[PDB]
Chains A and B, each alone.
Chain A
Amino acid sequence: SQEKFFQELFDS
């Protein structure tokens, strides 16, 4: 999921 790619990766 590219959406999660913006979220998970930037979370930490």
Chain B
Amino acid sequence: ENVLPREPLIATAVKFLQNSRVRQSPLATRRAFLKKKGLTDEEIDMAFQQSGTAADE
């Protein structure tokens, strides 16, 4: 499944998101992206909650 909820994923995700362009990248990408990378639904809002996007969750 690969989608095993892991904190290392969150850390890598937050880095990814707030690196530069990902914050400006549409969530249409970001949603499928994190979920396919291995983050469950819970984890994807976790990463976005920590990074603080607060837009189209």
Contacts and interface: CB of A to CB of B under 8 A. Distances in A.
Interface residues on A, range: under 10
Main secondary structure of the interface of A (DSSP, over half): helix
Interface size class on chain B is under 10
Nearest to B30: A6
The DSSP consensus for interface residues of chain B is helix
Contacts of A6: 16, 29, 33
Interface string B1-35: 00000000000110110010100000001000100
B16 A2 contact: no
Interface of A: 2, 5-6, 9-10, 12
9 contacts: A6-B29, A6-B33, A9-B15, A9-B16, A9-B19, A10-B12, A10-B13, A10-B37, A12-B12
